[PDB]
């Protein structure tokens, strides 16, 4: 079997190759298989609160981002498979009819750096809300789905500095806007890359070896790995025990950027190579905290010197919100955004006849679902109406009646959804509302002439009134104004 | 090979079978593939004004949906492959890991039907914009992409006749708003499933073979075959031209409801089963009409005798938005949207100790990128801004100076963006207006103390004014409010 195999695949255009995918691409399924493929997405429940939770959150969030000036643009969905980016993090895999191996998107980030590299774009601000898979443990399901949002800034000037503070302005207005998000005191963490690396060599880690440290530190960050573990797993790259210590004594500081400086002018004693790296991370970190500190942002800005986030693909400053959740009476903390500059992307994409200098590129990303979930836990619960008024004919006579006045409501700007059953007990009518979430109703009948019933279920007072036909609109909208 | 195959296949949870998918999985890709995958998508230019012109277009379609009452709802991407449905046309075929055969959608319309039949969901309005995937016919390439729009209405109510007024009504709305749709002098077609039916056989053709005499007509109406070839194709299905020189004369007829009448009643004289058929297949249509005049539509509503469109999966009434648009002198039907009762594909998906009725379901397609390429096309095109005013500092003192201004004017809500160089030249500045199409600039100096000097580039008439900072808001709110 494993001779014919790779016999088979050594030709991926010749006929038996060709044959064999075929073969494995007509099998039967059977309907079992078939029906609990997604038994855990579609289990059957279904509540409208939560959709409209979601679109008032995304309507929000994509209401900030275009006042700063910004376009929405899109990326290709599939892209071909390299595991010199996702060696560890495992994605999604799937193969196509033609012997391919294609990926689903673990990220925006580097499709939109392929773009920009393959697209020779210079200047451009961006944003997009789609979807992220991961690959599910056990066999024969669908892969999990969250949401992602994205803000990319790409620059072709050599003040690199300022934007940097314009996307954490952009995250703090986007926190202002939700007063569920203002309660929960968020901070804001800073680094470089620069000076992570300072660090390790000053530390003694070999410059052949970095990649592998950065690895580990961030499996262990993200993991929340045992310390027995953590120390077998070093001493398992033959690394001394003193090299530990010496990284544990660094990466255990946080603070303030004039607290932390006795800790950072140790390391400017050192050879040519870390006061030279330590030299341009301390220039960056301070004047990003003083452009930041120019434009009043309240949230307090710390320097965080063990922050380990993707430091593979990041050239320069990273930074992360971080609020402490009091849940379960632990204080687990909860990452809202990140990122950082990632112009170090650009140059494995470009072609064979591509000129110019790379341009600056940075990022961030949002959990849209833990705005979501934090604005319904709130008590004081938000509210959303799908309708302004709903429009109730009484009798089969009154329908055309109801029809015309709901058109021309709609004329008028209003929302306006209109029942279909002309039988509908008072009762049922007022479970439908009370399900529906609908506050006001106007009943249209054939006994008052020209008149219509408004009635309003608003807490615990039931009042109802006779609202002239031809002011039904104007009373709307007066009260809408007034509301 | 084949027999190794085979054997291997019988077990997929065997280890062979395990062992081939890791096999297979593990391949590797030369750079010049990876490049070439996707040449034909990037191709290496690019432009803001059709991204504005789509998201434009995208939040008026949306804001039409949202005054009806509805909302957004997302189903999952990957279904499982079903070649009942799917037999004929062609869809992007992909495997994951473990063998399973998975489809990408190939419309939403289905993917909604396993989701209402899974959710039991009884009362619900919704829309929705994704994407869809159409393989491609060369080799090693990226599939096809394409931007649909959807509106579905879920209703349990028995007299379920005017809902597809309301949608038809909805896309009149559509039409209206964008004043390049008003000129093409857009029809409404309508047809029934029953009188087709009705139509076949009392034309002969067997009650067993009405699939593939479907299948043939909606080939023959798309690709538009030839008439010899159309008639060869008919002899091969052991049919006789008794049943094709009799079917001819029943679909060329198209016209008004109260025109076609002589033709639709002189089947009303057959067997109890075609009466039956056509006396639901004019009721439905007759009801319709009605409802559609009472709403004053303009829009000329005509029944089409020979309209074939997915008859598979609609149970009712079909319609359809046709425009005889002129290109290169000739008259191409171009089609703007479609839909239907589909409430027969709720039954397959639902699960064996489903209990319940089946309700309603009228759903409807538009197509965004046909109204984007023709409102691009208008002679008077539409300018979209993507800032209202442009900051530019000049020289390094007053950066400071323009980036609180810039904050300032944002805590306001005006959209603006600021420019990050300083050294640009007048030349410069006046280039980049012009092709981000921004016409309000302010520049800021110090050397003019608190005054700003506001620039503008309307048309052939430069006009230079100096505004106070204090009132620099105002001015450009009453600019704003102006026109």
């Known amino acids: 079997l494993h001779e014919v195999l790779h016999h088979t695949l050594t030709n991926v255009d010749g006929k038996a190759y060709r044959t064999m995918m075929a073969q494995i691409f007509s099998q039967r399924i059977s309907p079992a298989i078939d029906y609990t493929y997604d038994s855990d997405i579609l289990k059957g429940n279904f509540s409208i609160r939560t959709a409209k939770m979601q679109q008032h959150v995304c309507e929000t969030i994509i209401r900030i981002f275009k006042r700063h000036g910004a376009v929405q643009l899109c990326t290709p969905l599939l892209l071909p498979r390299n595991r010199q980016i996702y060696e560890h993090n495992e994605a999604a895999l799937f193969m196509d009819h033609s012997g391919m191996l294609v990926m ?22 961006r944003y997009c809300i789609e979807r992220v898979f991961r690959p599910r443990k056990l066999d024969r399901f669908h892969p999990k789905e969250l949401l992602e949002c994205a803000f990319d800034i790409v620059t072709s000037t050599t003040n690199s500095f300022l934007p940097t503070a314009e996307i954490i302005y952009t995250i703090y207005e986007i926190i202002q806007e939700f007063p569920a998000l203002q309660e929960r005191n968020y901070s804001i963490y800073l680094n470089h890359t620069m000076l992570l690396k300072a660090i390790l060599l000053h530390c003694g880690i070999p410059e052949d070896k970095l990649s592998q440290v950065y690895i580990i530190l961030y499996d262990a ?263």
């Open 221 to 483: 960050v993200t993991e929340k790995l045992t310390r027995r573990e953590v120390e077998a797993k070093f001493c398992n790259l033959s690394l001394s025990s003193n090299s530990l210590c010496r990284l544990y004594k660094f990466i255990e500081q946080k603070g303030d950027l004039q607290d932390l400086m006795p800790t950072i002018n140790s390391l400017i004693k050192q050879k040519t190579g870390i006061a030279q790296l330590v030299k341009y991370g301390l220039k960056d970190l301070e004047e990003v905290v003083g452009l930041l500190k120019k434009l009043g942002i309240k949230l307090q800005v710390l320097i965080n010197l063990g922050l380990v986030y993707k430091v593979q693909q990041h050239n320069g400053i990273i930074f992360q919100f971080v609020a402490f959740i009091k849940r379960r009476q632990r204080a687990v903390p909860e990452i809202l955004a990140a990122g950082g500059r990632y112009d170090l992307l650009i140059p494995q994409f470009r072609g064979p006849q591509a000129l110019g200098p790379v341009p600056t590129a940075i990022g961030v990303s949002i959990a849209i679902d833990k705005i979501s979930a934090a604005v319904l836990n709130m008590e004081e619960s938000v509210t959303i109406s799908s309708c302004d008024l709903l429009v109730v004919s009484v009798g089969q006579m009154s329908m055309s009646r109801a029809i015309n006045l709901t058109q021309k409501l709609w004329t008028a700007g209003i929302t306006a959804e209109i029942m279909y059953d002309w039988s509908q007990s008072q009762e049922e009518l007022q479970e439908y509302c009370r399900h529906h979430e609908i506050t006001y109703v106007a009943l249209v009948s054939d006994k008052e002439g020209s008149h219509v019933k408004v009635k309003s279920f608003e807490k615990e007072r039931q009042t109802e009134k006779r609202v002239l036909e031809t002011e039904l609109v104007d009373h709307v909208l007066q009260k809408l104004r007034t509301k």
């Open 104 to 125: 689903l998107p673990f990220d925006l980030r580097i499709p939109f750096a392929r773009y920009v590299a393959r697209n020779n774009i210079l200047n451009l601000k």
